[PDB]
Design a protein around this ligand. Structure first.
Ligand SMILES: Nc1ccn([C@@H]2O[C@H](COP(=O)(O)OP(=O)(O)O)[C@@H](O)[C@H]2O)c(=O)n1
Ligand SMILES: Nc1ccn([C@@H]2O[C@H](COP(=O)(O)OP(=O)(O)O)[C@@H](O)[C@H]2O)c(=O)n1
Lengths: 221, 225
């Protein structure tokens, strides 16, 4: 089977917070539409799949010229893991070789340009993940974890060390997760060593969860 | 020398962020004043010292009935560490025994009661630090550190990145509001974090740090509630 670069956009219809979140408009285009446009304008994929449980999401995806995979309710529940979602999608279309990229619609400021640049980091030989990430406001080394009562993340001295003396800290932003397809299937997870990062600014890393996020991101445009 | 509980409030007059920040009023009382009030109302200290480099700060502190320590330009510079400022305060008044507490004027919502509660955690036998902290929005284990230009490594486990928050140890970060230490220990260690460090948990709201004009508004809004 020839290798294929597949984009999987998990877009279940219901959302804890904003109802019908994936269909909420931002500048007149649904979140789903924005991510779909990013996938298309990136030109990094041979196949773009939108996986969902509802007819309304399906209809929207189709209008955008991409493929639709219908997820069973069980795989679209609040306790349904995204990894199981992506595995089901790859099995449905029968692909197990190439690359598979998860693109969440909740990261509407992530553009095709972003995806493409993140793709240039993927190493075909090593096959580690390429995950988009953004800088941390509060440095993770200057924290403590409860154990019962608390212990420093690393050293106590870290808590008094100025940023410049400490390593650069970054956190995944959920916009992009690129992996070698066979590796993701074998590992059953999105982070595969050696994981590489694609750095995105705080602005473009906005993640839609509330009505406020929607307006905020609608302004950044 | 008899033991004394000392409160040190480092308040340089100038700020490259918010001009004359420590003198900026919030609901009629300067940031400095709010922190002095918290130190006084806590009733946890035998002495309250405000360390500064300027006359306007000193005058303000005096109006509150507390002691003033004058810092050399070098200890008030933008690179001067807070610990060197506290050491200097203790040396100036001559205290090297009891407890010393740093109370930053930039945490106006940290009250006298907050301080009192934090002190209840201090163990004068073990002599470990008591630092106020608040929960993290983003879990610190769900991060990676840069090693070499374009190479990174996870904080701990690569698997932690995908682990559900509920299944990870609760994380906290010092909020800069309170640091309580045995004085002898602080002087010998020359740092604010001494094992075993206990945390006094505070909410995000009460942990507001003042760095910008907006923070000041948010702080006044929270009070005006
Ligand atoms: N089992 C799942 C889980 C999430 N998702 C989708 O993945 C995206 C991110 O989910 P999320 O709950 O983390 O969104 P936020 O809480 O980050 O705002 C949304 O478009 C969800 O509908 C899905 O299609 N299936
Ligand atoms: N060496 C130092 C460091 C901090 N501080 C005070 O501690 C608080 C927090 O420091 P900061 O770094 O946010 O003050 P800025 O340098 O941002 O103006 C402020 O009230 C400062 O004036 C001080 O008086 N001396």
């Amino acid at each position: 089977m020839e290798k294929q670069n597949i984009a999987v956009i998990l877009a279940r219809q219901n959302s804890k917070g904003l109802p019908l979140k994936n269909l909420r408009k931002m500048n007149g285009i649904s979140l789903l539409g924005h991510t779909i446009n990013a996938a298309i304008s990136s030109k990094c994929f041979d196949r773009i799949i939108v996986s969902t449980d509802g007819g309304l999401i399906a209809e929207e995806a189709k209008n955008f010229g991409v493929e639709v995979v219908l997820r069973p309710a069980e795989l679209a529940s609040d306790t349904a893991s995204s990894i199981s979602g992506v595995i089901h999608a790859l099995e449905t279309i029968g692909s197990n070789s190439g690359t598979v990229t998860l693109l969440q619609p909740t990261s509407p400021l992530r553009t095709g340009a972003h995806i493409r640049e993140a793709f240039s980091l993927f190493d075909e030989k090593i096959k580690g993940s390429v995950v988009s990430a953004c800088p941390m406001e509060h440095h993770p080394l200057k924290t403590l974890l409860q154990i019962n009562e608390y212990a420093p993340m690393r050293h106590l001295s870290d808590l008094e060390q100025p940023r410049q003396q400490l390593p650069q800290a970054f956190r995944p932003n959920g916009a992009i997760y690129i992996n070698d397809t066979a590796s993701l299937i074998a590992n059953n997870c999105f982070f595969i060593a050696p994981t590489k990062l694609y750095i995105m600014s705080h602005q473009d890393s906005i993640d839609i969860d509330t009505e406020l996020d929607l307006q905020q991101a609608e302004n950044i445009l």
